[PDB]
Design a binder for this molecule. Sequence first.
Ligand code: ATP
Ligand code: CA
Ligand code: CA
Ligand code: CA
Ligand code: CA
Ligand code: CA
Ligand code: CA
Lengths: 372, 107, 107, 107, 357
Amino acid sequence: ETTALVCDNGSGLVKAGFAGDDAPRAVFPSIVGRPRHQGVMVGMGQKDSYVGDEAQSKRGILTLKYPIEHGIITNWDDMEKIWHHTFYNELRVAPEEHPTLLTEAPLNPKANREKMTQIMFETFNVPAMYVAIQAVLSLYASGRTTGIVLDSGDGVTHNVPIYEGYALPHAIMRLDLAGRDLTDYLMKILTERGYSFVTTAEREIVRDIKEKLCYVALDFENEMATAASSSSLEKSYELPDGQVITIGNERFRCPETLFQPSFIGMESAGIHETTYNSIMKCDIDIRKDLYANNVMSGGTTMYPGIADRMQKEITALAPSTMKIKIIAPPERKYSVWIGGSILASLSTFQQMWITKQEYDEAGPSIVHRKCF
Amino acid sequence: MESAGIHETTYNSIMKCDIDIRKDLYANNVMSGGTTMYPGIADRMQKEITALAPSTMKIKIIAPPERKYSVWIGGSILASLSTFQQMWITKQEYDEAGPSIVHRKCF
Amino acid sequence: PLNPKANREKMTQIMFETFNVPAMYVAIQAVLSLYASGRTTGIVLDSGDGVTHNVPIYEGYALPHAIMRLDLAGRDLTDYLMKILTERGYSFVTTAEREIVRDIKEK
Amino acid sequence: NVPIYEGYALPHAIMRLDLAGRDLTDYLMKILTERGYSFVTTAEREIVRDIKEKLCYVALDFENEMATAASSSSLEKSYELPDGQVITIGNERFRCPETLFQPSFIG
Amino acid sequence: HMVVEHPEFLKAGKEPGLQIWRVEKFDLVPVPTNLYGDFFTGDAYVILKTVQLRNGNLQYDLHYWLGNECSQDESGAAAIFTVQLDDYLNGRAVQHREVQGFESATFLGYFKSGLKYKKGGVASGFKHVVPNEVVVQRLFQVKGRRVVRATEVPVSWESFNNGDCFILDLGNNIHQWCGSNSNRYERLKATQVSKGIRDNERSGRARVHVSEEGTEPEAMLQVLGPKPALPAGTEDTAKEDAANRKLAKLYKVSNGAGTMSVSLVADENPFAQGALKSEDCFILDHGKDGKIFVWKGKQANTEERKAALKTASDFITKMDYPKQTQVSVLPEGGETPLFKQFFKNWRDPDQTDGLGL
Ligand SMILES: Nc1ncnc2c1ncn2[C@@H]1O[C@H](COP(=O)(O)OP(=O)(O)OP(=O)(O)O)[C@@H](O)[C@H]1O
Ligand SMILES: [Ca+2]
Ligand SMILES: [Ca+2]
Ligand SMILES: [Ca+2]
Ligand SMILES: [Ca+2]
Ligand SMILES: [Ca+2]
Ligand SMILES: [Ca+2]
């Protein structure tokens, strides 16, 4: 009779809603703000901790902290504040009635799983609970049972090979750059034009500049040549102070950090050949399907031209005796939630819930044997 | 005096704030005091701030007719609020802490 | 704002010792003026007879680094009017004449 | 802050933190008002810079230095302004170098 | 590899043969036998063929077939039921993806007659929602001298007066209109209700605009029409303080006495926040403009909550409230700020006391 809840806890963007829906009900950034000046207007509803999009609204007069960094839960009290704001303020429901479905990062440490179980079962008193993986739920969102998933959100980039509807734990690999590092790179390469962004308050302004005005160059050197020669691609942006900035070659240099990590100094591989490195670690006989299902997921796959450049870079260094296609649905930024909505609404999911009484005579250890 | 006018003082008061809150502060300029009781000062203020600010912004200036006594009216409000009764500097706090209690309590 | 501390200690000392009040609070004028308007967000230009100060407050939180103060108010306007009235040959030197020039400035 | 390796800088690791002796001079201009000394214009900014150069020091630990400044008067010292008047400065001698370690003092 | 116990899988793969399943709203139904070999173009399907070997064991083969017009839930359901049916099996099966028009040659070989496709299919189990949508067009009059309260008023220029204050709610834009004859307390209440309806109902996804006479924005004039001559405003007396005092009725429902009990808590706002006990469930009835609020406790039983909803639904028909009355269900710590105005000094848990640090 009751409806389940899906809550995808992203590293910089958390999604939530009810099971059986074609889109998440609430999308809001996972930010906990704290005030940095003294409140002289007393009695007028001043709070010691602003959380969620409310913190994003009055972001100038706050210091902002991310409770999840790099896809892994670190600050737990702020993460409980994200949960309290999610259940009570956003979804406007009591947790005691509705079962709750959560999403976890691949290769999560088990202590984080046990503590997620403990603060769900003790603090909010849920009747049922379940934990699932980002990438395989994106693969179920793609309508496939076998493939690679490049899940590139705000914290990390994950490359997950899946065969027969199960991941292969030897072959999931992690590459630690995403849109936060792209925002910091764009923060670096706007200083030469004379515009300064140094604090966390205007970091979301630079993030909005990255979201509205970026594209992936199919070839980089000729795009340097045309950007240096002409000025057809130079476009203006309106800051909320009213100053108008203008952006030239920095519109497309910021996506290229993903393909060239030496732009921001680390020695690791770019996004195109680490998928090759992951797929060489798999068994041979599977690879004929495994190249064919190139599932792209995450909000940093929203750039125009990422698919054509991905197709070109895979087709350059894979052997030429095999066809490569790249698939990218328009809803792949919400695909983890869409997978959670379809899995929570199944006719076979009622026996896979972890009920309260099963938690009582097992403690916080039953989540390992059932979410598996 | 080589210091600039009240319009540029207002403008760089807005500019010293950080970038996210200029929008709301342009549209809520409030004047008070008897020295703002000249006729036509609001139009000159609107023209000078409209000249100094970028053209995309809307600038609104609030000049109520009771602005001479607005400090006292807000004082009657702040003394009348229910929250304020746990910020009174009592006699025993002054007796235990000297006159330096007022900088730890007020502002 | 930005008065010396010794004003606050001496004001505390004469209110608590001489008159023997049971409570005291002291507040900023521009905060009280923003209480009068009913808003929370805004910049208040409070200009009395001695002090003209700009205070911006976003939501409930004031920004003390953006507080501007200028000693340009009705006293200096009255004195400047007393200076420029000699161009028509009218001389005003005494304090009652300063009150009369204050009345003509108001009127 | 510039790292240099093999006699050449590393442009990815050079950073610019935008406060220096101008902002220290402006903060000392802010924190001399509470002793009753008023400096407003650019002519006496150089005097505040000279006061900052002659009488400042970085405290090794801040809170016990503030406690000893509040309790005793062994670190309070005088300066001779070029109009002949003598100012005195106490705990503000070391609070103004601390803005480099704590930028939240200037917001 | 945790095995499922759905009862329809018990007849799967027990004899050699060929079995077909159709998805209908996150569930499997087996299609009849004479409907084999043909499929709907707007549905997804699950295909099993299980084949006996010479040496004794029984091999399996799974396929999942997608139409070009099937919705997302049907395709994902076909994939997850293929995975769950393989998981119910002991991992001895192989899976294959089948696309409408682009099937494998072995898939054509199973059906003797061939493949024929018909339009239509079963409807999707999803319901259409957007992320972060509001469609709201309301107008609140706040009024009073000491006990200031809000009342919903219909959206027209004729409802405006100069003596009160008004809150025009238009979704992402909230407009605060102050009268010239309006006083200090209802201006403060209008500002407090405005910041509440921004930061609690919309969670900061709004922008609050403050305006007075002559400075009306284009949004107010576009929604409300051209501005007529305003019919002044009555001076704020003490009789409407008593009228605002008589607007809400706080009731209790609790099974602590071992039986059903609807009892009056109070009939005189401002109420006490401590009166809201956490083990019971309460009703506020501001039904003159059509609002009733069902406050649920954390330690309240389910039958108390159902009885509160039943009694609140009875209150439309008993006292003859008009037919736009909304039943708003409120848990602890997530209260609407229109509910908060009837209480004396509402305290959120993470509030700032004094100046703050
Ligand atoms: N149109 C866009 N253009 C560029 N970047 C975008 C766009 N839309 C979203 N992003 C970026 O995508 C990120 C958010 O994506 P997503 O919601 O998938 O991440 P997440 O779930 O929070 O992350 P993670 O998977 O690391 O936990 C942010 O860095 C955001 O700036
Ligand atoms: Ca994600
Ligand atoms: Ca004054
Ligand atoms: Ca269908
Ligand atoms: Ca198998
Ligand atoms: Ca009235
Ligand atoms: Ca009970």
